[PDB]
Design a protein around this nucleic acid. Structure first.
Ligand SMILES: [Mg+2]
Lengths: 51, 360, 227, 363
DNA sequence: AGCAATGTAATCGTCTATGACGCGTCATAGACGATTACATTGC
């Protein structure tokens, strides 16, 4: 498969600690995971902003 | 002198130390046996009767101190067994040995070697460990609920962390912490800062040069210090730090022909007691620095014939025994003829005999 | 020259293997990280992005036990030269190639497919447009690579991009020879035992996340930092 | 790949089961030479079959000596990382030792541990590794350490008897008897405890350097010795002497310098802890003590000062020697305890290299 | 040089503090102490 799942998304479904991600350092919860159709509509809105 | 009461085969291991506070002649020994020899003994009877023993520790006891005050009749005994701990005891009267552990539980983590109590004239004590730190406590009896609070963190000047052998307290504020190789540090009571720390001047050629004992003189200006030169013992005084000479027998200059093991200053600073492993005692005038007299030590001097210990366990003849310690009992402490006006002496020889002596 | 392209995953706010056609373990060259930049740029932009690219060098060198050779712009491209250190040419020859000839009759053998540069590039869009705002594009850049390494590109290429596999082999590569030399005694188990160290899924960092995690620090995993 | 597979297997439970590969556990544990060789040969073969054909991770499992499950596997099945996990070298050492033992077993001649270590130095490294793994293997098969698996210690203790006939049964199954010569400073090569010794004032010397002065002087004291810490064969030899020819000898004595190490050596000679097979309670302690060097320093020894480690060892040797024993005054360890008590408080050791005089002679 | 001793670090079990869920209770995880292995000392 070639889905390419985000690291962020991986923790939240399964066993979370929110502390172990500190030393592991995978934590950066700003960009967030973007769904494919919602990704398309979002990039369309971003492009439409530029004009 | 006059040979007053003694006791042979008192203990069975090695009897290492002795102390006294008028009523008592407390003496710890090898196999953890505090055997307080009640001092006020009349007639001629040997002090065993008054020997109120109490098993303390299986490891083994080297040192012992005791402080009697005049309040309440508080009187404690402090021993520092070979295993590294502070065994205290409430001695109150047939005396009962009631152990009050007035220390904490997080501090019993290193081996304390020697200690000295400083009377309130505010009771204190200092007990240096085998790492080098010169620990200082503070006593607060109050209703029986003592608490011993730690204040001392006097680190080891001489490097690295060597054997802190000797301990003392000045009348005013000074603490001489003799080390395994010279460097008798002088510190202050309430500043925790090491003052002038000297060394044994005659330190030529790599050899053993230890500090068997340091003892201040009454008023608090003299700093007589014993040490060990190779296989010979000497004495070196100071003022509380300048070298002012060395006691020596008439003939290098040595006080004894062997190791000088323990010292003691009298009530007002006129005499010194040099306890040597050679087998005798030499008394010195502090001001003039000559020897007053010589006191031979013999095994047969024990009054009871069955208590004589002239042959060791292995089989040789230790006729002349070593003296692990000698102590002074102040004016009027003993009981007998001329006890009030005369100062008294006490010694603990290596042949397991504790012998008292009267001034004459 | 097999080519694999991952599905376009872009979150905002193509591995090339130069081996024959085929159960097989992959190893790097002797490998490049080479991403193109555009705003649907080499001018100005690229010049600091290059340095931000160099900011990953720690992760590339301290963590993955790699070694850089050059970072020189190729027109509109950043070269991140990477040569293998754990598996040198001598090591690959000794392990998988030399015993691949003597013991032909033995089955269960792995075919080497060398891995070459992978370039999965996505041009992110920002409201600023002409000018560029920084100090958040740093987590923005870290997120994609951190997700790519942990999740997909490590369950089927363990030997070429994994974190806790390469280190495990380096811990156990020195003693890998006597074990085979004392079991079947010639050399035959040695071109496979390297294809079994890489073929376990318990060594992936995904497993290491969900375990009891007894040893407190490891695998800092923070890459492409600010210059 | 976790991408596109997480939907099949849910939650942290059973996902570790999925990611963990199944381990084909192999029991090294669970006996004559043929019986011992059968298990060893089957073990290596069945371990190799899994790697060669099924590509299944092996897991060497065994129960070591108790002070118990322990596992060494390949390829580090372990979760996360543990700095200790640099241990596949120990597994390789175990496998190589098994191979070497199985190869040298049918030859029928015992080979020393030092020879085995010298044969392959790169992987074994320190001989302590081989020594420990040999004991682990012996205990794991329930093989008695006394009945060696054709592997013997390299031999240490020398003697200076002025005969000492040794008899033994030699395997290959056959029994043969031999006689070994003595009479000059040399070594007695080997004899099992099942084998017994005969004989045709014993002075133990632990330093072995002062030994090679008293051998020169000799001012008829058969002079059995060892080295710093005694080898197994030396204590075996002393026990065999006391067990078969005790009558002829009289007053055997140890002689160690008065450091904590010297008294520890004398103790290890005379008295051992809970596990004891051979202890030689015969021996008497008349070593050169603290009160045998200071009381002679007037008509000379260098002397020394206590080190931090020496004091710690001597204090630890005081906690033990008397923990259960009720009284110091009457006890078989009275002399050692009191001597260490004196040495702790005197603060000075007394090494013996120059005091060598007629102390060794009884009277 | 075969056979010891110990100090230290790493790991494992247990206790308690905090957060979450249906003011009390349960689960989880972080920190502390105990146990053991390895090697750096040493004749
Ligand atoms: Mg020595």
């Amino acid at each position: 498969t070639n889905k390419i799942t985000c690291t962020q998304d991986f923790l939240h479904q399964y066993f979370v600690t929110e502390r172990v991600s500190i030393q592991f350092g995978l934590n950066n919860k700003t960009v967030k995971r973007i769904n494919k159709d919602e990704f398309d509509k979002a990039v369309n809105c971003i492009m439409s902003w530029t004009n | 002198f006059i040979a007053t009461a003694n006791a042979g085969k008192a203990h069975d291991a090695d009897i290492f130390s002795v102390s006294a506070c008028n009523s008592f002649t407390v003496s710890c020994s090898g196999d953890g046996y505090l055997k307080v020899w009640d001092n006020k003994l009349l007639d001629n009877e040997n002090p065993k009767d008054k020997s109120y023993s109490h098993f303390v520790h299986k490891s083994g006891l080297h040192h012992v101190d005791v402080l009697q005050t005049i309040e309440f009749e508080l009187c404690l005994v402090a021993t520092t067994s070979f295993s590294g701990d502070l065994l205290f005891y409430r001695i109150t009267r047939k005396v009962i040995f009631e152990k009050l552990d007035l220390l904490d539980s997080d501090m019993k983590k290193h081996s304390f070697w020697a200690l000295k109590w400083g009377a309130s004239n505010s009771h204190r004590l200092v007990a240096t460990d085998v790492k080098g730190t010169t620990y200082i406590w503070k006593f607060h009896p109050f209703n029986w609920s003592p608490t011993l609070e730690l204040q001392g963190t006097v680190e080891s000047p001489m490097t690295p962390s060597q054997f802190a052998t000797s301990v003392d307290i000045s009348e005013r504020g000074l603490i001489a912490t003799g080390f395994n190789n010279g460097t008798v540090q002088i510190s202050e009571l309430s500043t925790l800062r090491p003052l002038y720390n000297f060394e044994s001047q005659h330190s030529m050629i790599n050899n053993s040069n230890s500090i068997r004992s340091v003892k201040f003189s009454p008023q608090g200006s003299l700093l007589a210090i014993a040490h060990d030169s190779n296989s010979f013992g000497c004495i070196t005084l100071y003022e509380t730090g300048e070298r002012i000479g060395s006691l020596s027998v008439p003939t290098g200059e040595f006080a004894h022909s062997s190791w000088v093991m323990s010292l003691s200053f009298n009530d007002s600073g006129e005499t010194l007691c040099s306890a040597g492993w050679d087998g005798k005692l030499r008394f010195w005038d502090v001001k003039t620095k000559e020897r007053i007299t010589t006191l031979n030590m013999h095994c047969d001097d024990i009054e009871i014939e069955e208590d004589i210990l002239a042959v060791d366990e292995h089989g040789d003849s230790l006729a002349e025994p070593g003296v692990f310690d000698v102590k002074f009992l102040k004016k009027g402490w003993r009981s007998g003829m001329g006890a009030d006006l005369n100062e008294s002496l006490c010694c603990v020889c290596l042949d397991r005999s504790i012998r008292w002596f009267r001034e004459a | 020259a097999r080519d694999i392209t991952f599905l376009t995953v872009f979150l905002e706010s193509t591995v090339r293997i130069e081996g024959p056609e085929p159960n097989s373990l992959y190893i790097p060259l002797l490998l490049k990280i080479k991403l193109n930049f555009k705003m649907n740029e080499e001018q100005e932009l690229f010049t600091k992005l290059r340095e931000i690219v160099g900011s990953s060098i720690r992760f590339w060198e301290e963590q993955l036990f790699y070694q850089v050779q050059d970072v020189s712009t190729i027109e509109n491209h950043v070269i991140l030269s990477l040569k293998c250190t754990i598996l040198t040419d001598a090591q690959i020859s000794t392990f998988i190639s030399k015993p691949r000839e003597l013991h032909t009759h033995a089955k269960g053998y792995p075919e080497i497919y060398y891995l070459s540069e992978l370039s999965t590039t996505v041009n992110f869009f920002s409201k600023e447009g002409n000018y560029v705002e920084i100090s958040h594009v740093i987590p923005h850049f870290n997120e994609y690579f951190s997700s790519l390494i942990v999740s997909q590109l490590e369950f089927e290429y363990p030997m070429v991009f994994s974190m806790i596999s390469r280190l495990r082999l380096k811990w156990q590569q020195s003693s890998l020879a006597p074990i085979s030399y004392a079991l079947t005694s010639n050399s035959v188990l040695l071109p496979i035992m390297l294809n079994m160290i890489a073929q376990d899924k318990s060594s992936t960092t995904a497993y290491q996340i969900l375990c009891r995690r007894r040893g407190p620090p490891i695998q800092n995993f923070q890459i492409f930092s600010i210059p | 790949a976790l991408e596109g597979l997480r939907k099949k297997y849910k939650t942290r439970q059973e996902l570790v089961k999925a990611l963990t590969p199944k381990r084909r556990s192999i029991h090294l544990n669970s006996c004559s030479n043929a019986d011992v060789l059968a298990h060893i040969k089957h073990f290596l073969s069945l371990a190799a079959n899994s790697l060669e054909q099924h590509q299944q991770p092996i897991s060497i499992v065994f129960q070591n000596k108790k002070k118990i499950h322990t596992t060494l596997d390949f390829p580090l099945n372990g979760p996360h990382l543990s700095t200790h996990q640099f241990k596949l070298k120990r597994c390789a050492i175990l496998l190589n030792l098994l191979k070497v033992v199985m190869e040298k077993l049918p030859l029928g001649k015992n080979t020393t541990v030092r020879d085995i270590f010298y044969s392959n130095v790169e992987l074994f490294q320190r001989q302590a590794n081989v020594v420990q793994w040999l004991d682990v293997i012996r205990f794991n098969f329930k093989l008695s350490p006394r009945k060696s698996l054709n592997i013997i210690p390299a031999q240490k203790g020398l003697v200076y008897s002025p005969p000492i006939d040794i008899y033994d049964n030699i395997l290959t199954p056959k029994m043969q008897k031999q006689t070994i010569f003595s009479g000059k400073p040399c070594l007695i090569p080997f004899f099992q405890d099942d084998a017994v010794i005969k004989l045709g004032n014993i002075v133990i010397v632990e330093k072995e350097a002062v030994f090679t002065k008293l051998v020169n002087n000799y001012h008829n004291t058969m002079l059995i010795t060892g080295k710093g810490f005694p080898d197994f064969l030396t204590r075996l030899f002393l026990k065999k002497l006391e067990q078969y020819c005790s009558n002829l000898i009289s007053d055997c004595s140890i002689f160690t310098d008065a450091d904590p190490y010297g008294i520890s050596i004398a103790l290890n000679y005379t008295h051992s802890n809970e596990r004891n097979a051979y202890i030689c309670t015969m021996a008497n302690y008349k070593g050169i003590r603290i009160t045998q060097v200071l009381a002679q320093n007037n008509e000379s020894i260098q002397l020394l000062s206590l080190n931090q480690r020496d004091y710690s060892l001597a204090k630890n040797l005081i906690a033990s020697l008397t923990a259960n024993s009720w009284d110091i005054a009457t006890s078989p360890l009275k002399n050692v305890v009191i001597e260490c008590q004196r040495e702790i408080f005197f603060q000075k050791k007394a090494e013996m290299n120059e005091i060598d005089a007629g102390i060794f002679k009884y009277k």
